[PDB]
Amino acid sequence: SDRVRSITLGNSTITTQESANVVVGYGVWPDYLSDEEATAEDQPTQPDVATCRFYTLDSVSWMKESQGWWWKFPDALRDMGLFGQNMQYHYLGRSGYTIHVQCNASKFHQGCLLVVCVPEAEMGAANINEKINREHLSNGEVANTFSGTKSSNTNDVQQAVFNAGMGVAVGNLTIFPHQWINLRTNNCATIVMPYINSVPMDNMFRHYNFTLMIIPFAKLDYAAGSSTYIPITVTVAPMCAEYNGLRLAGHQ
């Protein structure tokens, strides 16, 4: 059957046995930048094995009262090997991604996640005329968490699930490349995400390309003898990463 899928990128391999399918972007597969759409004049850097490979982020715990999580993604891979180093030494970056999310249960557990991959998720603030600190939009490989009600913390994102931090209807948030992790059919959700920007290359510190969002619509539920701890693991692999404008290390 087509439920078993194997993905190899570099020296890292994922074998799944209850997959659903693979969503590829807006139909476009990630490729390198051609000479007609180019702007910069010098030779790029294509590592292609030491960069294009699966990196595993932190596992998050999914209780019955969990609301959702988000990661900003050119910035969650800041300290992930030679991808993060090549981010630190160059000025212009350009890559696509492969986002694989693991969550397992048994046939006695129920629940349903929505894994969305949203371009340009410019988020709102908890206090309206106030500036958000960078530690709340992103935290690296550590997830930020939505809240169930109207949050009003200082220098923080408005954390409500029914507005997704952006002021929209959370049910209408499926216009983006998405899958579901339904615990009675699924085990994982693979999303191939190409490069989307208004410019051909961009800096990978000053800009946030997209935002993964994992939101449980059907709440997690189980009986009085089943397992309580259910983790959720996100694994990311850059694809067709190239780099331009080499200079010293830093971001300022």
Binding site: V28, Q110, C112, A169, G171, I175, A223
Partner: protein, 238 residues
Amino acid sequence: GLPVMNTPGSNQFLTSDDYQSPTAMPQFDVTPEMNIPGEVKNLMEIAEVDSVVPVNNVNENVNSLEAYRIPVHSVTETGAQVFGFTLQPGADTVMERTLLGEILNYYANWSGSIKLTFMYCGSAMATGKFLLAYSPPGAGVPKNRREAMLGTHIIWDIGLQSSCVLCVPWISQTHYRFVSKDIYTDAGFITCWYQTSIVVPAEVQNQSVILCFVSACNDFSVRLLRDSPFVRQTAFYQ
């Protein structure tokens, strides 16, 4: 020069004009064009994507995510009503703020079929059946499962394939309805009933959750532009 005569409509400004006007920056070199994935040529491409329906908008469930959860469980006898709403994509409170409801609320006439997709988000060891009925108007709302199976329906058996499609057929007097409410173009009622109950084994939770989706079919249309009744501002955005 050339003798000419001015008609009515001269020296006016119509908002829907389609004329030619001089450029304020002649010979301006426009930047080149780049292939960006996800180009939209029609809002009807957007309106054909499934999106989740808040069926459970009942008295402060809207200020949470519980408005999307349709509660379902084991029953005592059989044949009770699960939920129900009226087929008004843009006037009904259920599918008002949904994506089809937004795009249709930028229009005044609509036409074509509607898909409703229902996902069962319970456990792998639970079974059940449902009756997903559509009833054209002329009578009222069907009051039991006996009156509900006299219209367009489908029996959905919950198994490995986790989602069903009730495709609402376009059955109308005219070619177009109205997006706002009137008695003349009334469309009917979407209702859902227990065919058989939810039988579950021991040490498994009983109460489960159905999610609902809506989109348009490939014969769908919208006709008359207007402003959306959702935009309400008072002052400027200084």
